Amino acid sequence: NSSVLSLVNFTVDPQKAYLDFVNAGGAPLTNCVKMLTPKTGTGIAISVKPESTADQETYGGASVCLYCRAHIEHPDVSGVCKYKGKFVQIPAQCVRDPVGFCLSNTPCNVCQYWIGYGCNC
Amino acid sequence: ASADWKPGHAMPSLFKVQNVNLERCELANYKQSIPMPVHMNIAKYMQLCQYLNTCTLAVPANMRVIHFGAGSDKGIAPGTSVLRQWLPTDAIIIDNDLNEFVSDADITLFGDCVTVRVGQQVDLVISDMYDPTTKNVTGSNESKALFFTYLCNLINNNLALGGSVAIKITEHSWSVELYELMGKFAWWTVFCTNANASSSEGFLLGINYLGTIKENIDGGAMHANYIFWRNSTPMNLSTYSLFDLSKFQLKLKGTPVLQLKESQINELVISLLSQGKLLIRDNDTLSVSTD
Numbered sequence: 001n002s003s004v005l006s007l008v009n010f011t012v013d014p015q016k017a018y019l020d021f022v023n024a025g026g027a028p029l030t031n032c033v034k035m036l037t038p039k040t041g042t043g044i045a046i047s048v049k050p051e052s053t054a055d056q057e058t059y060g061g062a063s064v065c066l067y068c069r070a071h072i073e074h075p076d077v078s079g080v081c082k083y084k085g086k087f088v089q090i091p092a093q094c095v096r097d098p099v100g101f102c103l104s105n106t107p108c109n110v111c112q113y114w115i116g117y118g119c120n121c
Numbered sequence: 122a123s124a125d126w127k128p129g130h131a132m133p134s135l136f137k138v139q140n141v142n143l144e145r146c147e148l149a150n151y152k153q154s155i156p157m158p159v160h161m162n163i164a165k166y167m168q169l170c171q172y173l174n175t176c177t178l179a180v181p182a183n184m185r186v187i188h189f190g191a192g193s194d195k196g197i198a199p200g201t202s203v204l205r206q207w208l209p210t211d212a213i214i215i216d217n218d219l220n221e222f223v224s225d226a227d228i229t230l231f232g233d234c235v236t237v238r239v240g241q242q243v244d245l246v247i248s249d250m251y252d253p254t255t256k257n258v259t260g261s262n263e264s265k266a267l268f269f270t271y272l273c274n275l276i277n278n279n280l281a282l283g284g285s286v287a288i289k290i291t292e293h294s295w296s297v298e299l300y301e302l303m304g305k306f307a308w309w310t311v312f313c314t315n316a317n318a319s320s321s322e323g324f325l326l327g328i329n330y331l332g333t334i335k336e337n338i339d340g341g342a343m344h345a346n347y348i349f350w351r352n353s354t355p356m357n358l359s360t361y362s363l364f365d366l367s368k369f370q371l372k373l374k375g376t377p378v379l380q381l382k383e384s385q386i387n388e389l390v391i392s393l394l395s396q397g398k399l400l401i402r403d404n405d406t407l408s409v410s411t412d
């Protein structure tokens with residue numbers, strides 16, 4: 001943790017820096033805050049309350065945000081984090097690297113499910 | 122095994138009314154851990170929340186919740202996220218810790234809790250604070266000051282009538298003054314989660330603040346009663362209560378917030394306060410900053 005977190009402070013593209021690190025064998029960021037949930041949710045990517053389906057796990061949003069975890073500027077032109085204060089659903093097969101998954105994907109702009117993991121548009 | 126499916130154990134009046142010396146706490150399963158599927162504090166906080174689901178908590182719109190001791194040595198705040206999952210979506214969470222962390226709170230303040238200046242009154246105080254030096258046990262187990270001085274003043278000044286508190290204590294991390302302040306609530310207990318049953322930890326609960334003395338409590342004797350209870354009560358580690366979470370979220374009670382002068386507080390108002398049906402405090406915008 002304290003290494004990959006240290007790494008993404010030595011680069012201009014923290015998203016690419018993290019992904020290249022874990023794509024080359026780096027240990028994913030640990031200690032993401034996994035919640036216990038009734039697997040009866042809608043399955044959207046980001047939600048005010050947990051929304052995991054039986055195929056998903058829910059995390060506290062700040063804990064899966066690279067920018068929150070590394071204490072660096074968020075890239076949102078709004079300056080407001082998309083995850084913090086909310087909950088984020090991750091496909092269950094991807095719990096090994098929740099942060100890597102979030103950096104690697106984008107919720108659907110119309111249906112709010114993960115593109116390729118729920119979006120049916 | 123009924124109790125295994127409960128979120129934990131609450132101190133019964135059987136032990137509240139005893140009168141005994143303060144003895145050493147000796148738990149049979151001391152420091153045994155239960156495996157989690159997930160940080161242990163997830164299950165601890167959810168069990169506390171489940172028990173508070175059985176209490177007459179006031180649950181207004183724009184509920185004001187402050188969470189002290191929210192950080193971990195990992196830089197995250199599992200308890201705050203549980204509070205986010207539990208509380209109404211429009212609840213305001215302010216959390217605080219000595220050390221840096223990141224959380225799903227609305228407002229996060231670093232530094233000693235004493236630097237946390239609350240301009241208004243809040244509706245719910247959660248404290249998980251514990252000072253590392255309490256581990257240096259030398260001599261008598263005496264009432265502690267530490268952050269309890271701050272919390273006691275908070276209860277007396279910055280807590281709405283009808284508001285509640287849940288404050289972590291242990292065998293050695295405890296305060297005579299805080300126990301005595303439980304006598305200013307409609308009801309009080311100590312709640313011990315099943316997930317951490319092997320610890321002398323308990324959450325001292327004051328339910329529905331009344332601002333006036335309802336029960337005269339000898340705080341030193343009451344801590345001796347709490348330890349006598351722990352020493353007398355087998356508690357099996359368990360998270361069975363988290364197997365069914367269909368009703369985990371705090372009920373959306375729409376509790377009203379009223380402004381009232383002290384002299385207007387009649388018997389009707391006290392009854393409503395004591396039932397979780399009313400809060401008395403400002404309806405301004407909340408201001409919680411570091412000083």
Ligand SMILES: C[n+]1cn([C@@H]2O[C@H](COP(=O)(O)OP(=O)(O)OP(=O)(O)OC[C@H]3O[C@@H](n4cnc5c(N)ncnc54)[C@H](O)[C@@H]3O)[C@@H](O)[C@H]2O)c2nc(N)[nH]c(=O)c21
Pocket residue numbers: 146147148149151249251252253255256258291292293294319320321322
């Ligand atoms: C109850 N108890 C206390 N002691 C002895 O008395 C000392 C102080 O006792 P305590 O008041 O710390 O209570 P306890 O040991 O039950 O607390 P525990 O470690 O479970 O800590 C509870 C919570 O305090 C906080 N905490 C503990 N340590 C720290 C820390 N170092 N920094 C921040 N928070 C901490 C955490 O939230 C933790 O979950 C113990 O360290 C031990 O020598 C016992 N010894 C035996 N043999 N059997 C016991 O049952 C027993």
Ligand SMILES: Nc1ncnc2c1ncn2[C@@H]1O[C@H](CSCC[C@H](N)C(=O)O)[C@@H](O)[C@H]1O
Pocket residue numbers: 162189190191192193194197198199200201217218219220232233234235249250251252253267268
């Ligand atoms: N005086 C004080 N002001 C603010 N935080 C304090 C404090 N004294 C102790 N603490 C905090 O008490 C915390 C106890 S452990 C907190 C665990 C946290 N609730 C979780 O969910 O993991 C420690 O982080 C410690 O820094």
Ligand SMILES: [Zn+2]
Pocket residue numbers: 062065066067068069074081082083084
């Ligand atoms: Zn963020």
Ligand SMILES: [Zn+2]
Pocket residue numbers: 108109110111112113119120121
């Ligand atoms: Zn879509």
